[PDB]
Amino acid sequence: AINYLGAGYDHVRGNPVGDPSSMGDPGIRPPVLRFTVLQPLGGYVRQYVACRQSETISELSNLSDYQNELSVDASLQGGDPIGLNSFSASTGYRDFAKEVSKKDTRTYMLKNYCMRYEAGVAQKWNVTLAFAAGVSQLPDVFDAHNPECACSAEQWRQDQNAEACTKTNVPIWISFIEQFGTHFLVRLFAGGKMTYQVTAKRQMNVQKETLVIGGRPPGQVSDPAALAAWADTVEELPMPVKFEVQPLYHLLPVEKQEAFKQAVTFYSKAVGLTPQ
Amino acid sequence: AINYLGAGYDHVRGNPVGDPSSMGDPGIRPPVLRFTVLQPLGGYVRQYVACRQSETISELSNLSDYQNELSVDASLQGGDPIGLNSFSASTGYRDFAKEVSKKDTRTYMLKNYCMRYEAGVAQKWNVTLAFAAGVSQLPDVFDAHNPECACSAEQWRQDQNAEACTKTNVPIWISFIEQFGTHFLVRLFAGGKMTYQVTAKRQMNVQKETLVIGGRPPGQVSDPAALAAWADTVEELPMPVKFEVQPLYHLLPVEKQEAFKQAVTFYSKAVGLTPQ
Amino acid sequence: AINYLGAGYDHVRGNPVGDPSSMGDPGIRPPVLRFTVLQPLGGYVRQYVACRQSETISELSNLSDYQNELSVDASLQGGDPIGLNSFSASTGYRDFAKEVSKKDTRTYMLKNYCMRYEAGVAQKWNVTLAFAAGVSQLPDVFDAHNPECACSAEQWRQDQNAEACTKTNVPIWISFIEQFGTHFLVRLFAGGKMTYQVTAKRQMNVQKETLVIGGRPPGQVSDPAALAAWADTVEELPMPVKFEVQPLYHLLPVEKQEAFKQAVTFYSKAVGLTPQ
Amino acid sequence: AINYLGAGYDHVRGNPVGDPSSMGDPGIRPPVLRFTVLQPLGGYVRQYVACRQSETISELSNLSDYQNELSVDASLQGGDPIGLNSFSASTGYRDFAKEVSKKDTRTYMLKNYCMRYEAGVAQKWNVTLAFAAGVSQLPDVFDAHNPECACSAEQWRQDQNAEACTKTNVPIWISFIEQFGTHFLVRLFAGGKMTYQVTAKRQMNVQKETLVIGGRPPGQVSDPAALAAWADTVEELPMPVKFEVQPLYHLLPVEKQEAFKQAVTFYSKAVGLTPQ
Amino acid sequence: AINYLGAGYDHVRGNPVGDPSSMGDPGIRPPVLRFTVLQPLGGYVRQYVACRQSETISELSNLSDYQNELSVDASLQGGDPIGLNSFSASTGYRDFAKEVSKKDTRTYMLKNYCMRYEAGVAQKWNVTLAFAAGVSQLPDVFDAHNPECACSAEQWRQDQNAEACTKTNVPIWISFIEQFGTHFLVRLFAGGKMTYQVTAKRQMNVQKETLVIGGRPPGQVSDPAALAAWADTVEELPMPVKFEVQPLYHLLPVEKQEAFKQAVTFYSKAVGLTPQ
Amino acid sequence: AINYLGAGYDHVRGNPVGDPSSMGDPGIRPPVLRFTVLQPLGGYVRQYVACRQSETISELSNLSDYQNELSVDASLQGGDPIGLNSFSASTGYRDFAKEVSKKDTRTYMLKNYCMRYEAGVAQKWNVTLAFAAGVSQLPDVFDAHNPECACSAEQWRQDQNAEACTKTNVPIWISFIEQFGTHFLVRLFAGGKMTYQVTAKRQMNVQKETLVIGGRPPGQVSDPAALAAWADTVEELPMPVKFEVQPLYHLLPVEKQEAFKQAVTFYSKAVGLTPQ
Ligand SMILES: *[C@@H]1O[C@H](CO)[C@@H](O)[C@H](O)[C@H]1NC(C)=O
Ligand SMILES: *[C@@H]1O[C@H](CO)[C@@H](O)[C@H](O)[C@H]1NC(C)=O
Ligand SMILES: *[C@@H]1O[C@H](CO)[C@@H](O)[C@H](O)[C@H]1NC(C)=O
Ligand SMILES: *[C@@H]1O[C@H](CO)[C@@H](O)[C@H](O)[C@H]1NC(C)=O
Ligand SMILES: *[C@@H]1O[C@H](CO)[C@@H](O)[C@H](O)[C@H]1NC(C)=O
Ligand SMILES: *[C@@H]1O[C@H](CO)[C@@H](O)[C@H](O)[C@H]1NC(C)=O
């Protein structure tokens, strides 16, 4: 199968309940760590019998409830939320924001976890070659951290190709973040996850949207047989459905760690959406 | 698949819940705009995983409720209703008018949306060759705007072949409208939509009519297997089930815009049905 | 498929809910009108998507309720009942009369309409060649209209081969009516119709008879699969399940119309059953 | 198919709800009448669409109720019961007698009729060749009608091979009755009939026996699919499930009618079971 | 098929609801009677249509309820219980005794009879060759009937190879009993029988054991398809599921009958289990 | 099939409800006893018809309830618990400890037994060759039994390769225990066992984990068909689901029994987890 342990993760663009243009979390990025059924040196893989099943239901009354429900499946190592406008750039976040602004409707989220294995590390890492070259191309200073830098977060949001930004090294940092993300996965439950977002008026007016992680694309969620077939494809193509991450700056040389931290704050502000 | 972004739309003859002689909205017209998975220049296409599902139910007590339920799926850009006797020339509108005039029955509408992708433009357009030639054959003045013109809207409704009309340029404008419509689609959700119209007496007397948009013709709506097969055919032949339009006069030269607006008002009165 | 627009109809022997010896209304007669997906000149055919479904239920307390339930599906143009002992010569009429005479039971009728298309004319007709020859062989006077004619209606009911009738021209008229019926179809909804007649005692004593119009012969009404298969055969062999007729004398030369009206009154009296 | 109109019938050994050693009424005998979809001369055959279904339930508190439930399906022409110890020699009669003698149980009978056609005669008959030869072998006198005849009904019940009977012509008459029965079918509803005899104690102690008429042997009555398959085989092998009979002595020469009537009374007493 | 009429039966080791090491009653022994669809001389076989079905349920509060439920299916001719520690040596008897000793649980038994035919004799029998030779090797006296005989029933239970027993002829008699049983079947209903023994605590703590007679070994009792397949194998391999027996001493020469009765009492005490 | 009678058993690492890395109890070890459908000399094998089914449900409020529910299926001969930190080193034990520490959730365990046969011994054994060689390599004294020995249980838990332990003979004893376990199976019920561990919050928040013993790996527990297929594979690969064990020291020479008992107490403390 595919290894997602050590994969990069964009906490701003990620969404652990899914996206209609991806079969997994859209924040998952190419692998960042390099490793050595089979156990990776320094970590572990524990395979399940069939699928470890779990289900959740939550009434999402505001944006904070949706944020908390996403943070349950994509948090810092230990369970603390990533924050920093996490998930706010994803489509599902914007869709739910539009639906929750309507006070005449109430939305619930139902998660169905079909877990197939667990993997993790415990801590002297070696990174991938692509990540190493990318880091070697990074400067030691983040230009937008300087007060009165012409390239501010709004300037990047409005026009990143303006002269105010193209003269600084900000596009290099943002290209790195766009390539590898802001965090990396240190622990994960992989398999399939089928989540239903159900919106009810105040007429039995009810709407139901289906969001899927893992397996092959399912033809019909209402079909029982197609659902079972999707569950059969989950065994073949499992993908992370609940994971914990560590910040990427722990993997950079210290002379770039502070500038990278400033770069990810800048990125979280320019790409992320404050509730406005 | 087939591109419907920029397709013409007759707001008078259209019906966004369907027509028994069409697999889609009977008002959709051949493409009016020309464009350049793949993204059209100036717009966007966002593909879904499987089907984005949604369901609605509404009690239709009068003609205005039906107008509102159709306007939900076929409106001006921004969500405002098209109005101007919209949908009033379609078969479904006349059938429902006949059913709602009977005060001894109550009718409900259940929509089932099976959406596969979204497309749109944001605004320097280029039109199709057929639309350009059609516009080049149009005059600069609409004759029926002149007061005391022998060719009025009622005269066209009674006999459009009469001398009062064949001497004016009105038939040219109406042939253009009959070819390309009155608006054009600027944003759309495409796929399938199965709508049930259920009429109950005041005896468990209940009638149910099925209207379908998108996919291949379904053999049996009561059959579960035939319904699932139709859902499988929606992936192959998706069609607009909820869209937003802009008036066509924005695409004509400025010297013809006023005459075209007068022509579409004339058309809305002569072909459209006021509640009488 | 087969064209039933303009088909003859015997309103006395007809029965729009079916017959165990026919797959359609036993009163339907060979085509009377000649015509020119495809639209017949002077009329229209409107094809449905799948099946337009409808269901009815009625408690039949007496013969008049059954007469009204049949008249709903076989009426004059406009909805008025045909009458004139309509349907009274059909088998189902006699069966239900026998069941309703028993005051210790109560019978209900459940109709299930599976309509596939609608057809009609609007009015200069030409008839078929067989109908033209039949009319050319008709006299201008109906002998039984003369007072004290030896050939009365009951005399025809008892023995039509008696000398009292074989000397008059009545057998010619009755042969014509027996060939083409008394009316002809001017509007029709065709497809399939499954009607259940359920008789309950006053012990859960219940009897259920099934009567079918349209499609191929169904093997088992209780089998779900065989019922679905019948619904699939309705698409192939659709037959009129709800129609409106016009009297046949409108199609005869004026010199024969009065004698034909007298002939159909005589026929309705001799063949039809008054509730005795 | 097989014609049962005019078949002989042993009213003593018959049982219209069935027998496990026969697929039909065990009292049906070879055809007695000879005849000429197709209509037999002197009678009628009326075919149904699919199956005319009917269902009954009755609580059988004593032997008279069971006698009445059987007589409904095998009666004299007009509906009057055959009587004369009818059905009393059949196995099902003896089984039910054993069960109804137990006052600690209560038995119910549920009939399910799946009728496919009706046939009948109206009255100059010709009998079959076998029946004619059998009658020609009959004497004009029945010996056991003579008072103090050594061959009585009890003597026949004890030992029919005793000298008291073999010297008289009683064995000839009883051989004729054993070959052709005592009545013959003049009207019949043929098809399938599944009857359940359900006995409840006074613990939810319930016993259910299945008795089947018509069609092919069904594999499993509790299986839904095997039941449907049996219903499909009923179309192929329909058998009388509700019929009306006339005494056989109407078909014999007048000089033998009285002796045959005495022979059938003798047979009903010697073979039939009075409730002792 | 296999004939079980006249088969020997060990009433001590038998169990008519089944055994996990046998497909039938573990007490059935090789055939003892010799006989001559086809009818055996002196007896009868009555074949059923499909399966004569029956169901029973009983709450087994103590050992006597279980004894009565087994005696229903294996009794003396006429319905009287065999007694004499009948069934007490079988495994199922010991299992249920262990479960009924626990007063914190309650056990119910559900029988499902699938009967295919009935057979019996009515009474000059001839036995099989093996049974005749076995009887010819028997003495005329049973040694353990002599008072104070060193070989008692308890001594046989403790050690049958001790000098106290091997000097007497008791091992010969017990070898005969071990070969042919203690009774023989004179009437039987054969087919399949699925019995569920359900034990409930006093938590929805429930245990269910399945015991089967007849047919082929079933793969899964909870599977509907495997159950139906077992029912189809019952048609191929029917076995006695409810029978009536007569003591074997009626088949021995009179000089050996009394010694055989003493031998079967001895066997019932030494092998049977009194409720201790 | 495979013999598990006489297999070694590690009571510390075992878990009789399963493990996601094993198809059976993870404590089962290679066979320790050597033996001679077929009956092993000194023991017995009793095969069932299909599956002996049983089900249990228990609310697990604390670690002791889980310990008791596991001890039901893996106990000393007679039913007494093994104790000595039994099961505490298994993955399932640690997972349940983590879940029961959360006082905001309540966990239930549902067992489903599908038993296929029972085996046992009654007591002069000969052991396997591997076990005999392993015992011959054992010393007669356990070094860690000496007070103030540098190699204690905590030292073994922290670092077993330290000089404090590698100088003593403790690694030899622990290698023997790691190979053959601490007990061996003397009685067993083998087949399949599907256990559900269901955790409920205090929102219908519910989680369900599936643990399986026996048969082939099941693809999907929620699929009915995959569950039935697993039940079909249990017949092919039955494994112990409820067994009773005896301590291994009964199989060692008397001069090594005390040192082995000290070695297994040492192992139970060093590898086992006390509730801290
Ligand atoms: C990768 O890192 C691991 C430590 O996690 C180390 O053991 C290994 O040697 C490293 N890879 C190489 C090629 O040295
Ligand atoms: C059509 O218009 C688009 C703007 O949306 C433009 O990019 C494109 O070049 C035009 N077509 C051609 C052939 O130039
Ligand atoms: C039949 O009638 C139509 C109009 O109803 C007419 O156009 C046509 O000419 C007629 N048929 C022939 C053969 O002329
Ligand atoms: C049989 O009887 C019919 C009348 O029921 C008669 O028409 C026919 O001639 C008879 N058969 C023969 C061979 O004559
Ligand atoms: C078997 O017994 C029957 C009577 O039960 C008898 O007629 C027959 O002769 C016996 N068999 C032989 C071989 O004699
Ligand atoms: C092992 O012991 C069995 C009895 O349990 C004995 O029959 C057998 O001979 C021994 N093994 C060998 C290889 O002899």
Numbering used by the authors:
A (entry chain C), B (entry chain D), C (entry chain E), D (entry chain F), E (entry chain G), F (entry chain A): 465 to 500, 514 to 600, 605 to 683, 727 to 800
Sentences from the study reporting this entry:
We first obtained oligomeric crystal forms of the TgPLP1 MACPF domain by the use of in situ trypsinization in crystallization drops. On solution of the resulting structures, we found two related assemblies: a ring-shaped hexamer and a helical packing arrangement with six subunits per turn. The ring-shaped assembly was, by contrast, found in a C2221 crystal form that diffracted to only 5.0 Å and that we phased by molecular replacement using a single subunit from the P65 crystal form. By contrast, however, the ring-form oligomer crystal structure is imperfect with three main-chain hydrogen bonds being found between only two of the subunit interfaces (“A-B” and “D-E”). Together with the low resolution of the structure, which was only subject to rigid-body refinement, this suggests that the ring-form crystal structure may not represent a functional biological assembly although it may represent an assembly intermediate. In the crystal structures, all subunit interfaces in the helical assembly are identical, but the ring oligomer has three different interfaces, with three, one, and no main-chain hydrogen bonds, respectively, in contrast to the six in each of the helical subunit interfaces. The hydrogen bonds observed in the helical assembly are in a different register to those found in the ring assembly. The ring assembly we observe in the low-resolution crystal form could be an intermediate on the way to the formation of such a helix, but its poor geometry and instability make it a poor candidate for a biologically active structure.
